[PDB]
């Protein structure tokens, strides 16, 4: 009967609200003053990467912290060198409209995808010596928002039609599909242990996903508007997301609620890209006010600016060792900072 | 010892070859013009897409087409494969020279939401520079609809009764004064949204088109000439 299910839903939501109320008994700024600050973070453009014609939507580093790929709206997917500023490859894409790019942790594969609804996979290490497309992943209806490689034969692809999906490249077909979102899931980051991945949507619901089970473990809603970028605080037990609410915040998986939010009165535009530094002290946030920003991830007060672009910052990717950070933007220029 | 130097050399010739390719594709990329076609599903956007396709073909996701007017490459993007929401994938269209907006003028209620879509396009932060070209399809259909009678535009638009035509090209389409009064009321209803805001960066360029039309490609040609003249003057900084 419908009213019994409605009162069960009432009991469930009262249980969730009471768990949030009784669980919340502390604040990170309030319980410990013994935190030491980060102070000024002056980041200078060590080297400027100038090949792209149109705006840049995604970049992704390699595991070696030297190579990095960036895809742009002219239809080029350039693999860069963060030392010599040299273009190892520049793959011309089928579709110009490419909102995402991912580079394999092994290093042999790189992926594109976007509004054309295909998540194409490009193999680099070949005996012929020319970059080719491995296979075309066609199981999505809405635009592809973000993709992340699991290994050489698994990739997870978030889309605009509520569907983030696990795949299998050499089959040519889906393996799993995660459908719990309401609309427009935008950015997804993989857990360090690779067993999990979280994904934020336009509902302002950032939903955890279990790869092995296939369903949503926990759902996080603490934002007032649609979500543009998400990450992992590299412990894997916490993660912070930045949305078009013009604020950003950090949720903990075990605490399963809002924990600490980073905002200011002056900032009146939403994060486009966010990422975490290696030790997780320096939250690093792109923005729509044409410059990046740098946030202390605990004390909740900004600590650095990377104003070197005169367009919105769409890309921000730290290295695996911490030896850089590279922010792309819509002026077709990629800048590595230190 | 020496293989580092050899790798530096080979990497250098690789970078030089890649940049030669990129300076070819810069000319290829700037030689063509991008046009985000957008509009309602009953609005005959696909009809004019077929017309300039005859005068390459879309496969999935985006139903692209290319057409040339006086050896100028026009390549325009009908975004049809995606979902009903459109707030996020339209941010990907600032390199576009001009949005093309197609409207079924005849179906009123299917015209107010066209007005709201224009108001959302105009005030979008990443489309503030982007200038709408506005088409008003189904001209003969609206002519019959307000000529035959019993479908009162005054019901769906209350200010049409007091509205009078200011100055217009009446005599050659002059089948009746009511059809011209109605159609100029509709374009003024779009243009009031157009000229309400803007720092001179973008402007609406309204046109009238029926079902069977061929010269609308040249209309986009002349429009895009005027938009690019305006932004070149803006880079020339004279105000």
């Amino acid at each position: 009967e419908l009213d019994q299910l409605r009162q069960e839903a009432e009991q469930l939501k009262n249980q969730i609200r009471d768990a949030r109320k009784a669980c919340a008994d502390a604040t990170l700024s309030q319980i410990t003053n013994n935190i030491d600050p980060v102070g000024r973070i002056q980041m200078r453009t060590r080297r400027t990467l100038r090949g792209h014609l149109a705006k840049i939507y995604a970049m992704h580093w390699g595991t070696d912290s030297r190579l990095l790929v960036s895809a742009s709206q002219d239809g080029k997917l350039i693999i860069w060198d963060s030392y010599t500023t040299n273009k190892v490859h520049a793959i011309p894409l089928r579709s110009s409209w490419v909102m995402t790019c991912a580079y394999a942790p092994s290093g042999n594969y790189v992926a594109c995808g976007g509004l054309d609804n295909i998540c194409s996979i490009y193999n680099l290490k070949t005996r012929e010596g020319n970059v080719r497309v491995s296979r075309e992943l066609a199981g999505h209806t809405g635009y592809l928002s973000c993709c992340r490689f699991l290994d050489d034969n698994q990739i997870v692809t978030s889309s605009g039609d509520t569907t983030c999906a696990l795949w299998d490249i050499e089959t040519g077909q889906q393996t799993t599909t995660f459908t719990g979102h309401t609309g427009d899931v935008m950015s997804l980051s993989l857990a360090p242990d690779t067993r999990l991945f979280v994904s934020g949507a336009c509902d302002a619901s950032a939903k955890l996903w279990d790869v092995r089970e296939g369903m949503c473990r926990q759902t996080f809603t603490g934002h007032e508007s649609d979500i543009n970028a998400i990450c992992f605080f590299p412990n894997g037990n916490a993660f912070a997301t930045g949305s078009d609410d013009a604020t950003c915040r950090l949720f903990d998986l075990r605490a399963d609620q809002e924990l600490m939010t980073y905002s200011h009165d002056n900032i009146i535009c939403g994060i486009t890209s966010v990422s975490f530094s290696k030790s997780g002290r320096l939250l690093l946030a792109g923005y729509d006010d044409f410059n990046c920003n740098v946030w202390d991830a605990l004390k909740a007060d900004r600590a650095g600016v990377l104003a070197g672009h005169d367009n919105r910052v769409s890309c921000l990717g730290v290295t695996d060792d911490g030896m850089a950070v590279a922010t792309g933007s819509w002026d077709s220029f990629l800048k590595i900072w230190n | 010892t020496e293989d580092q130097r050899n790798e530096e050399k080979a990497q250098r010739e690789a970078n030089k070859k890649i940049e030669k390719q990129l300076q070819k594709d810069k000319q290829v990329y700037r030689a063509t013009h991008r046009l985000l076609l957008l509009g309602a599903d009953n609005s005959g956007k696909s009809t004019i897409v077929k017309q300039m396709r005859i005068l390459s073909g879309g496969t999935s996701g985006i139903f692209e087409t290319k057409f040339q007017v006086d050896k100028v490459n026009f390549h325009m993007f009908d975004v049809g494969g995606q979902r009903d929401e459109r707030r996020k994938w339209i941010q990907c269209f600032n390199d576009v020279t001009a949005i093309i907006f197609v409207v079924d003028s005849s179906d009123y209620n299917r015209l107010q939401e066209a007005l709201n879509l224009f108001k959302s396009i105009w005030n979008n932060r990443w489309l503030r520079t982007i200038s709408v070209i506005l088409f008003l399809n189904k001209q003969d259909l609206l002519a019959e609809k307000v000529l035959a009678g019993k479908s009162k535009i005054e019901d769906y638009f209350p200010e049409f009764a007091r509205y009078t035509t200011p100055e217009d090209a009446t005599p050659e389409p002059g089948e009746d004064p009511r059809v011209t009064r109605a159609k100029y009321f509709i374009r003024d209803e779009f243009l009031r949204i157009s000229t309400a805001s803007g720092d001179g960066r973008h402007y609406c360029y309204p046109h009238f088109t029926c079902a069977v039309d061929t010269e609308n490609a040249r209309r986009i040609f002349n429009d895009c000439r005027d938009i690019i003249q305006r932004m070149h003057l803006r880079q020339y900084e004279l105000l």
Partner: nanobody
Amino acid sequence: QVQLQESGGGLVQPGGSLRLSCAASGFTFSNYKMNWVRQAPGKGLEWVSDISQSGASISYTGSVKGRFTISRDNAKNTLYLQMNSLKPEDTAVYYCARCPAPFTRDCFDVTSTTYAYRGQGTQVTV
């Protein structure tokens, strides 16, 4: 958490009057350009009226321009719409639709999907 609580409805006779209420929570309410959307059964979902940030700029659908009056209390955290001279065709389900974004005038609140920032639903029939 996004919350849009709606109340006020029931059947009314033609030429009557009624009030719409849209209780909101979880966000800065004096910030967003809300709307009013309705779906008469058998038809699509259509926008009615819009209120900008301070409240000054108001626009109306060209059917309900003269009759309905829209207003809001940003302190009391509620949108309102006052009905006068109700036609027999104004039977519909009424949702207050909040924008995707703050600090801006563009707003895409018409969509047929499960738009996230639109109310669950209050029922008004005639």
